[PDB]
Amino acid sequence: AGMSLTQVSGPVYVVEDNYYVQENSMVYFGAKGVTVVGATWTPDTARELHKLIKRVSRKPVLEVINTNYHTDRAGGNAYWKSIGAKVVSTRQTRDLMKSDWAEIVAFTRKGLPEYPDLPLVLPNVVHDGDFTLQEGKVRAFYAGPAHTPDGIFVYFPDEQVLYGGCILKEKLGNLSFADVKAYPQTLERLKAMKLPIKTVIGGHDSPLHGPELIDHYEALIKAA
Ligand SMILES: C[C@@H](O)[C@@H](C(=O)O)[C@@H]1NC(C([O-])O)=C(SC2Cn3cnc[n+]3C2)[C@@H]1C
Ligand SMILES: [Zn+2]
């Protein structure tokens, strides 16, 4: 289908969003409500994800995290705000979105002319540091610049699942916004945290991998 939502471990689900360039995002089904990690490409793809969420749980969608300021992680924001969900990001992501949204939309449309000219929709919950949701079961952190200056990781300690949004994936992908020399330093900072990881979900290409996706991508970026 256009979008799928599949259980990875317990309350942790992976979204495969096949619109435009395939992007993978996360959903966490909590006791009081649902957290979406990555807003998906557009308001219409966000509505498609909501439809799948509502076949799994009746609990409200409480918040959606923009793991960077780009279209594939924040494009759905209009829809999520419209249904009362908070849109959550770091201060750095929010500030880059304000100044650079028009630029990323135009860049996205160069490769994907069919992609809509979406108006700016900013996060309404903004964090100055690392942060958690779902009583500490969803943990968002910054470990330096990589694919964009602002990209964050989201870790799910109970399930030992790491999501890196656009940072981790199978193919080199698009480096036009990246800090190529810092990229492996950020991945090494991440590895030095020694997080128990069983599963890494890539933000593009096939989602399900083990911890070695980090090493895979590190080696690719060091050759770029
Ligand atoms: C700058 C781009 O990077 C960004 C965009 O232009 O919106 C968005 N995120 C990527 C990325 O590398 O994470 C790309 S996805 C990347 C590019 N190619 C094309 N098809 C698959 N791959 C993965 C996507 C359009
Ligand atoms: Zn991306």
Side-chain angles (χ1 to χ4, degrees):
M3 190 176 279
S4 70
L5 174 68
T6 308
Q7 181 177 49
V8 56
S9 180
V12 181
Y13 282 60
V14 65
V15 180
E16 172 170 324
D17 166 11
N18 296 309
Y19 296 70
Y20 309 105
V21 175
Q22 180 193 327
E23 65 83 3
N24 312 305
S25 291
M26 313 289 303
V27 177
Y28 184 97
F29 291 93
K32 303 147 128 146
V34 186
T35 296
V36 181
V37 190
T40 82
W41 276 121
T42 66
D44 284 348
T45 64
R47 180 183 307 261
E48 293 298 314
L49 176 54
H50 198 183
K51 283 151 77 154
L52 297 173
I53 288 177
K54 285 194 171 199
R55 295 183 187 262
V56 178
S57 176
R58 293 169 290 155
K59 292 305 197 325
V61 178
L62 302 165
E63 62 242 334
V64 182
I65 301 171
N66 303 148
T67 52
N68 64 32
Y69 70 101
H70 285 195
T71 37
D72 53 346
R73 304 303 165 211
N77 283 355
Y79 178 83
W80 300 120
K81 285 217 179 151
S82 291
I83 67 161
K86 295 164 177 162
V87 179
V88 181
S89 82
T90 64
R91 183 78 58 192
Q92 177 190 21
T93 290
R94 175 267 174 215
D95 289 343
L96 284 170
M97 198 183 292
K98 172 105 219 154
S99 66
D100 292 23
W101 182 245
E103 173 179 332
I104 186 57
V105 168
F107 180 97
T108 291
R109 286 176 119 224
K110 190 188 300 178
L112 300 160
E114 55 280 9
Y115 188 85
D117 191 14
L118 293 176
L120 173 68
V121 178
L122 294 159
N124 58 2
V125 175
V126 178
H127 293 293
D128 293 304
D130 302 341
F131 64 92
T132 72
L133 286 167
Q134 292 287 348
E135 295 303 284
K137 292 327 187 172
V138 180
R139 314 186 70 85
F141 66 91
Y142 184 63
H147 166 262
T148 58
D150 68 311
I152 56 159
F153 295 90
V154 181
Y155 180 59
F156 304 88
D158 290 350
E159 299 79 16
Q160 299 193 28
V161 173
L162 179 70
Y163 181 69
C166 305
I167 301 169
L168 303 168
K169 53 202 175 201
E170 292 173 21
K171 294 189 191 148
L172 199 51
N174 200 296
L175 304 177
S176 313
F177 302 82
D179 181 334
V180 175
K181 289 199 164 78
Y183 212 128
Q185 297 162 348
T186 291
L187 298 183
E188 289 285 343
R189 272 186 292 262
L190 166 71
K191 287 196 293 181
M193 307 167 65
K194 295 165 188 142
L195 295 176
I197 298 166
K198 290 171 182 173
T199 292
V200 173
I201 298 300
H204 296 300
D205 317 301
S206 319
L208 299 164
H209 292 259
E212 42 287 318
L213 192 69
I214 298 156
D215 306 278
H216 166 96
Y217 195 89
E218 185 173 5
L220 284 185
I221 199 62
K222 274 156 117 193

